[PDB]
């Protein structure tokens, strides 16, 4: 992936920063961290050859339950240029005021 | 109970206690202990979480769940027949009947050798942190507030840092709200009175709802017309 | 108000202006710091009253893991403790150790005797407990191994000696105040006139008393010399 | 590369894709390769999934600047998917190698464009406005729908398409158009 | 669509299971 | 005259500008004079400031459709400003006269376009994203972030640029991001 | 980057197709 | 995934590095 | 010596052992001797037990550098043991005498390699993830399984194989693959 | 063994160090120590000739109940280079782009 | 170029290094220049420090496959450092030029590999091992040790070497072990 590594490293650095500032962090969130880096080592090891694309879908959709669950884990950002409603930059260029048998025309 | 048990986190009580300038040395650590003490002293069954969990009996003994506080029923898994309290003094001891059980610690002593038993038990509702979770009923909240205030004032009175009149007032108020809180959680709602009514009026009395999980206790008793 | 204002109020009411005075400002600091605790005990030990924010001070601690006795395997679990000795709190206010945020965290300051036995309750296994050992250090105890990562805490309480706790304040935004005289004295304004008149009464009589003022291998005080 | 227009036609019968390659002086060697359509059921993170909804190869249509611009009008009913309740994911790929003077980050061979039908959202807004006309009270479901749409927009713009699928399936799946 | 050395290592590891040496005929 | 592509690259390197004159048949004699880049700290109500961040005279090049379309890809490190905590104002000056009979209001010699980095804002909004799921509570943080961004948007599209800076300074000046790695990375 | 089984199947099939 | 042709060239190229 | 690969084949039909002797200039006289397979039932501390699962002698296969590398593909169904719920212990021995310049500690004639089938753990993780997808709550059994696996790993890496057998039999014995 | 000697010596040295620091140690742990060195002297004496390998298995598995039972007795560490999932360092080396009748080939 | 075997011997004597260039057919002209051993106390962000712990120039030997593969077995007592409370950084410098057409990012002249002694860490973890058995309690010590080790691991594999030393100093600097017996022992 190269990104599960980043998410896990960020998560545990936040974990130990919290344990440095305070002396406690919820074990319900340590559980999320344990699941997270267990998955990271699972997918970056000798057991990644058992994964189909259906398994990949399920693994990703199960990992995003951990996304905003705690402050250690964040929603990843990917490099995206899309949106639900796109912009239309097409231009209208008719030919000498012409039209077809039913409708207009352009170049 | 008429009202619903909506859960809220424990420092809701510290919001309210710390309004009193004399209770500003109270902590979450103290609130936890006194909250558990209040929960037990009241003994309200609506405050606990009902759970069902199956276990195996190895030989007249079985391992009990971790969060168990009190058992509603135990029954056999395959038959569904409930178990009773064990009165026998030599249960699995041989020399040279119906099933029953007995629970002391993490261990349940049944009269059966090798079967799966279903245990319907009560636990404490916990938080995202492994901490007790209290009802937000302002009667419950006020009574727990008054309990903690009464204990703190009792210590301070043992020192001589509070007047006896102040402690006497606190004890009076806590006593009244304790009775009121007892009546709040125990008096049945309308649906619970329909169940109690269907338990109360039987032309042909029903006396074997322990065998089932008290499933038919509030079922209405129909007589055919002739 | 600062140490300087109180010190010079006392000195000026005594009129100890000349550098050749028997009673220096050091006597004044000592007497002020002791009479502060004297008054704070007389006011807030009889019956429980509201303590103002003026009586409190935040000292600022660095914690280190230490063995229970020594490095042995069976000597029990280790503790954190402050690097430097901590002042004794008075038992009148709201002592509190907090993790650099007063409005956050749950670190409990308890007695030495209680802390021998804490955490057995299953719901109290994650609470960090504090107490000043007879060693003079603030010790921390918990059943949660996470507490051994704690590096820094602040301790806000009505400390029994204002000078010791003023030497260990956290840095201010501008920076540390090297001179104690430029720091703030920890007492409410309502208790400042009582403190001043007690110190001035303490030093008024001795101010005008005689001295053994001749150098003659003799005690000259019985003669009012 | 980039999208000229990417929408479902106003008659709810065609899914319009119009792709072009960017006009910089260092993309002359870059052309268009293929168009792969995926839905919220077959979508995967690492590129187009296997067994996609619709694979298109650009060489087949044309017999070189023609391959730098492609337009499609796919009859959605031929794709055997619902135009009302489907989230098409349109991948495009470039069969080219940009020049060596390409600035860092601009040599991205693949793009992605998410498509939904906006008609059901429009009708739902009209219903909620009609309810607002009575007694001038804003339904909470209307604010909920607005903020859920904003959540899905944020999920799309930040690249977190699976949680957008969860929100779409859970909140906007039952649509009438 | 850039491949790192690790991706090629995974490819080699998958392909080695399928191929065998001269001795193995 | 209009903007074709106005953005900051998501790798936080390049302030991308792509301006081109309108294609109508009254806009022949009008060309591009210069491009002036200005920041929130050096903004003036009318026209570019007398101390801009970057100036680019178009006519210092080949001397016609090359003049009518221009593109800049300025490296933000060279400008010595933060890609994320900065709001750019791109002024484009025209050179020429539109031939008469054009409707009035179209013969505007100058345009302004504001640029911000929305990636830190999306990072901040993703923190409150999950509040949308939970019912019985108002998603207050999500709503607050939406309104914060929409404020800068509307204040820009209405021409209320000063209040746009007041909101920018209040809300998003403390935005943080990973600075671009000067040594370029291998990928494709 | 991450490969699934199907990706490896495609790669090996395509290797064998051209050898 | 959807492998491009050039990617298959890349994979065979890197396999024949160890030729 | 060392292991090149030591795993159960992905089809759950072969137990692959590939052993080699280390390449240092002072191990030229060291060869390979035998391969002995033990399970969690017959394992003992002091070396391979009596009545092992499978004894292999290397001289038989070959007719000198050939004996410095050995590979095996043992059909597990021929061994009469379950590939799902078995922990193979693979001992290897060296019929050789290293040089006199061998550094202290490197003259270890025997090695050991523990083998388990990873498929049932993978399937169990998939089940737990599928349960996590519902209401985004982590089961306690999933954390339990993860930490029990870590306990067995620590027991293997520290050489405490019997307590690893107890943990394996008590926790991971019932496996479906 | 040579190791039961070490475990027993370490255990009793910790015992008497505890009795030196404190003046008490649980007799439930003195029982574990008694069992431990009784086994050590049993196996290092004239009664080691009665031990089969089944008896050895049972003795070892009964002794590891004492391993982490108390602070005196620890889990022994042996010199091990294994793990549950091993690393695959084999290399792929095809022959002039060749394949067999069904599959690939290498040297 | 890659590492074949990077470890500290379990007898706490030898820091074992075995580095070999990749076997691909673009890596002929590239050889091994030197091996620099560095510790946590003398670490620098870029390249080896100017005060390393040990330097080994490969070319001071037979002068080609002998250059492409090198092995060191340094005695740690000679280095005058603790085998267990020390974290080694092994820098390998290459000598030559990879022939063109190689994919970019593979022509990295230098690699770094971190080494630690996991035996004391396993000793510390075995103390909390048995908490896994008991139910109704979180194995807090076991989890803490697992996270402590995994922190150094991930901080190493991500290239975040400074935070790796901060964690190493915080957690494992006080590690103890039996020092190697200088007089070798009889066994086999």
- Is J96 touching I (CB cutoff 8 A)? no
**Is the pair F, B in contact (3+ CB pairs within 8 Å)?**
no
Q: How far apart are CA I84 and CA I118, in angstroms?
A: 9
Q: How far apart are CA B125 and CA B67, in angstroms?
A: 10
Q: How far apart are CA B104 and CA B62, in angstroms?
A: 11
SS3 D60: helix
Residue G12 to residue E18, Cβ atoms within 8 A: yes
Q: How far apart are CA C9 and CA J13, in angstroms?
A: 65
Residue E21 to residue J90, Cβ atoms within 8 A: no
Helix (H) / strand (E) containing J35 = helix J27-43
Contact C108, B29 (CB under 8 A): yes
Q: Spell A38-55 as b/e; 16+ CB within 10 A means b.
A: bbbbbbbeebbbbbebeb
SS3 A17: helix
CA separation, residue C138 to residues C106, C153, I158 (Å): 16, 11, 38
CA separation, residue C203 to residues C10, C196, C198, I42, K132 (Å): 9, 11, 9, 91, 68
Residue A60 to residue D162, Cβ atoms within 8 A: yes
Name the residue of chain A whose CA is nearest to D113's CA. A82
For F165, the token pair is: 């800076």
DSSP state, residue I17: E
Q: How far apart are CA D125 and CA D131, in angstroms?
A: 10
Q: How far apart are CA K108 and CA B112, in angstroms?
A: 72
SS3 C167: helix
**Is the pair K, H in contact (3+ CB pairs within 8 Å)?**
yes
Which of C126, C144, C149 minimises the CB distance to A20? C149
CA separation, residue J35 to residues C96, J40, J45, J68 (Å): 49, 9, 15, 15
Closest to I53 (Cα-Cα) out of I27, I35, I70: I35
Contact A34, K143 (CB under 8 A): yes
Would you call C25 exposed, middle or buried from its count of C-beta atoms within 10 A (0-12, 13-18, 19+)?
A: middle
SS3 K150: helix
Q: How far apart are CA J94 and CA E16, in angstroms?
A: 10
> DSSP letters of D134-169?
TTT---HHHHHHHHHHHHHHHHHHTT-HHHHHHHHH
In the stretch 49-78 of chain A, residues with CB closer than 8 A to chain J read none
Beta bridge partners of J104: J99
CA atoms within 13 A on the CB side of D156: 24
Residue C145 to residue K170, Cβ atoms within 8 A: no
SS3 B88: coil
* CB-CB neighbors (< 8 A) of G4 in chain D: 46
Distance (Å) from the C-alpha of residue J101 to the closest C-alpha of chain E?
11
For B169, the token pair is: 């007032």
Beta bridge partners of C66: C79
* CB-CB neighbors (< 8 A) of K123 in chain J: 74, 77
DSSP state, residue F132: G
Beta bridge partners of D161: none
Return phi, psi of residue C76, to 5°: 90, 170
Closest to K65 (Cα-Cα) out of K2, K1, K21, K109: K21
- Residue J4 CA from chain centroid, whole number: 10
Closest to F97 (Cα-Cα) out of F110, F107, F83, F87: F107
Q: Torsion angle of alpha carbons I55, I57, I61, I62, nearest 10°?
A: 160
Q: Torsion angle of alpha carbons C75, C78, C80, C82, nearest 10°?
A: 20
For C117, the token pair is: 């036995």
Helix (H) / strand (E) containing J58 = helix J53-63
Would you call I79 exposed, middle or buried from its count of C-beta atoms within 10 A (0-12, 13-18, 19+)?
A: middle
Residues written for chain C: 225
Contact C174, C3 (CB under 8 A): no
CA separation, residue F76 to residues B201, C179, D73, F45, F82 (Å): 86, 47, 41, 24, 7
Closest to D34 (Cα-Cα) out of D14, D45, D48, D13: D48
Closest to C40 (Cα-Cα) out of C158, C132, C193: C158
* CB-CB neighbors (< 8 A) of K26 in chain H: 17
Contact A84, D156 (CB under 8 A): yes
- Is G17 touching J (CB cutoff 8 A)? no
Closest to J73 (Cα-Cα) out of J22, J45, J24, J36: J36
Helix (H) / strand (E) containing G12 = helix G5-17
For D124, the token pair is: 């739902």
Residue G12 to residue E14, Cβ atoms within 8 A: yes
Name the residue of chain H whose CA is nearest to G11's CA. H8
Chains that touch B (3 or more CB pairs under 8 A): A, C
Chains that touch J (3 or more CB pairs under 8 A): A, C, E, G, H, I, K
CA separation, residue F23 to residues A92, F1, F35, F90 (Å): 11, 8, 20, 21
- Is J93 touching H (CB cutoff 8 A)? yes
> Which residue out of A45, A49, A50, A51 would a mutagenesis test of the E interface target, given it has the greatest number of E Cβ atoms within 10 Å?
A49
Going by C-beta distance under 8 Å and a sequence separation of 6 or more, which residues neighbour residue I55? I34, I35, I36, I37
Return phi, psi of residue A101, to 5°: -65, -20
- Hey, how many other C-beta atoms are within 10 angstroms of the C-beta on J77? 16
Show the DSSP H helices in I15-118 as ranges. Answer: 58-61
Q: How far apart are CA A28 and CA A70, in angstroms?
A: 9
Helix (H) / strand (E) containing I145 = helix I140-157
Name the residue of chain B whose CA is nearest to A31's CA. B128
For I112, the token pair is: 């050991």
Beta bridge partners of D71: D18
Q: How far apart are CA A22 and CA C99, in angstroms?
A: 6
- Is G18 touching A (CB cutoff 8 A)? no
Would you call K64 exposed, middle or buried from its count of C-beta atoms within 10 A (0-12, 13-18, 19+)?
A: exposed
Q: How far apart are CA B50 and CA B28, in angstroms?
A: 26
Q: Torsion angle of alpha carbons J26, J27, J31, J37, nearest 10°?
A: 70
Distance (Å) from the C-alpha of residue K129 to the closest C-alpha of chain I?
6
CA separation, residue F61 to residues F64, F67, F70 (Å): 11, 9, 11
Edge-first strand listing for the sheet containing B84-85: B62-63, B107-110, B100-103, B84-85
Closest to C71 (Cα-Cα) out of K127, J21, K148, J5: J21
DSSP state, residue F13: -
Would you call F113 exposed, middle or buried from its count of C-beta atoms within 10 A (0-12, 13-18, 19+)?
A: middle
Q: How far apart are CA H6 and CA E3, in angstroms?
A: 12
Would you call C151 exposed, middle or buried from its count of C-beta atoms within 10 A (0-12, 13-18, 19+)?
A: middle
Beta bridge partners of I72: I17
For B103, the token pair is: 């629970």
Beta bridge partners of C156: C58, C96
Q: How far apart are CA I151 and CA I132, in angstroms?
A: 23
Residue C149 to residue K141, Cβ atoms within 8 A: no
For I118, the token pair is: 């990873």
CA atoms within 13 A on the CB side of K16: 16
Q: How far apart are CA F115 and CA F92, in angstroms?
A: 14
Contact D72, D35 (CB under 8 A): yes
- Is I147 touching K (CB cutoff 8 A)? yes
Closest to K8 (Cα-Cα) out of K161, K114, K159: K114
Name the residue of chain K whose CA is nearest to E2's CA. K103
Helix (H) / strand (E) containing F149 = helix F140-157
């Amino acid at each position: 992936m190269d990104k599960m590594l980043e998410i896990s490293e960020e998560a545990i650095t936040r974990y130990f920063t919290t344990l440095s500032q305070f002396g406690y962090k919820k074990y319900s969130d340590v559980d999320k961290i344990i699941v997270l880096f267990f998955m990271e080592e699972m997918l970056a090891g000798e057991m990644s050859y058992y994964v189909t694309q259906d398994d990949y879908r399920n693994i990703v959709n199960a990992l995003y339950c951990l996304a905003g669950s705690t402050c250690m884990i964040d929603f990843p950002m990917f490099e995206s240029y899309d949106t639900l409603v796109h912009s239309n930059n097409r231009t209208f260029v008719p030919r000498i005021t012409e039209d077809s048998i039913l409708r207009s025309t352009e170049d | 109970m008429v009202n619903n048990i909506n859960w809220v986190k424990l420092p809701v009580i510290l919001d309210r206690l710390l309004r009193h300038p004399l209770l500003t040395d109270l902590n979450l650590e103290t609130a936890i202990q006194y909250t558990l003490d209040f929960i037990s002293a009241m003994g309200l069954p609506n405050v606990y979480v009902d759970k069902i969990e199956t276990i195996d009996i190895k030989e007249y003994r079985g391992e009990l769940p971790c969060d168990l506080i009190s058992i509603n029923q135990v029954r056999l898994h395959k038959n569904g027949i409930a178990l009773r309290a064990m009165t026998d003094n030599f249960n699995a001891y041989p020399t040279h009947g119906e099933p029953s059980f007995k629970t002391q610690g993490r261990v349940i002593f049944t009269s059966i050798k090798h079967e799966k038993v279903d245990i319907s038990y009560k636990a404490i509702m916990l938080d995202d942190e492994g901490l007790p979770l209290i009802p937000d009923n302002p009667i419950f909240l006020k009574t727990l507030e008054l309990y903690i205030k009464k204990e703190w004032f009792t210590i301070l009175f043992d020192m001589g840092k509070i007047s006896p009149a102040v402690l006497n007032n606190t004890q009076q108020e806590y006593a009244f709200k304790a009775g009121q809180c007892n009546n709040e959680f125990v008096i049945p709602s309308v649906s619970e009175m329909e169940a109690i009514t269907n338990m109360w009026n039987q032309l042909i009395p029903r006396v074997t709802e322990f065998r089932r999980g008290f499933k038919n206790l509030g079922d209405k008793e129909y007589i055919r017309v002739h | 108000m600062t140490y300087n204002e109180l010190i010079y109020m006392v000195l000026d009411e005594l009129k100890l202006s000349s550098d050749d005075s028997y009673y220096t400002p050091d006597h004044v600091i000592f007497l002020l710091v002791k009479y502060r605790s004297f008054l704070l005990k007389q006011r807030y030990s009889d019956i429980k009253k509201q303590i103002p924010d003026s009586d409190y001070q935040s000292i600022c601690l660095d914690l280190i893991e230490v063995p229970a006795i020594s490095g042995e395997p069976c000597e029990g679990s280790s503790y954190l403790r402050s690097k430097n000795k901590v002042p004794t709190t008075m038992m009148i206010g709201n002592p509190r150790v907090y993790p650099m945020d007063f409005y956050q965290g749950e670190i409990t300051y308890i007695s030495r005797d209680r802390m021998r036995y804490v955490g057995y309750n299953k719901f109290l296994r994650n609470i960090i407990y504090c107490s000043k050992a007879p060693d003079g250090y603030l010790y921390f105890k918990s059943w949660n191994p996470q507490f051994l990562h704690l590096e820094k805490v602040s301790f806000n309480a009505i400390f029994e000696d204002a000078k010791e706790a003023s030497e260990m304040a956290c840095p201010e935004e501008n920076g540390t105040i090297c001179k104690l005289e430029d720091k703030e004295f920890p007492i409410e304004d309502a208790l400042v006139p009582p403190l001043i008149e007690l110190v001035v009464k303490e030093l008024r009589g001795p101010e005008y008393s005689p001295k053994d003022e001749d150098n003659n291998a003799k005690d000259d005080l019985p003669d009012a010399r | 590369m980039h999208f000229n227009e990417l929408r479902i036609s106003q008659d709810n019968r065609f899914l319009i894709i119009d792709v072009s390659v960017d006009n910089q002086d260092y993309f002359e060697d870059v052309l268009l390769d293929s168009i792969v359509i995926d839905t919220q059921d077959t979508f995967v993170m690492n590129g187009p999934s296997d067994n996609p909804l619709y694979i298109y190869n650009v060489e087949d249509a044309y017999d070189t600047q023609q391959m730098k611009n492609v337009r499609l009008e796919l009859n959605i009913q031929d794709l055997k998917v619902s135009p009302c309740s489907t989230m098409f994911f349109v991948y495009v790929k470039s069969k080219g190698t940009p020049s060596t003077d390409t600035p860092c980050g601009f040599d991205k061979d693949q793009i992605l464009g998410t498509v939904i039908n906006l008609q059901p959202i429009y009708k739902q807004t009209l219903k909620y406005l009609k309810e607002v006309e009575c007694d001038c009270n804003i339904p909470k479901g209307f604010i909920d729908m607005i903020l859920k749409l904003k959540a899905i927009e944020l999920c799309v713009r930040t690249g977190n398409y699976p949680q957008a699928i969860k929100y779409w399936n859970k909140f906007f799946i039952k649509n009438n158009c | 669509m850039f491949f790192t050395q690790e991706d090629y290592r995974k490819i080699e590891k998958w392909l080695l299971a399928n191929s065998r040496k001269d001795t193995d005929f």
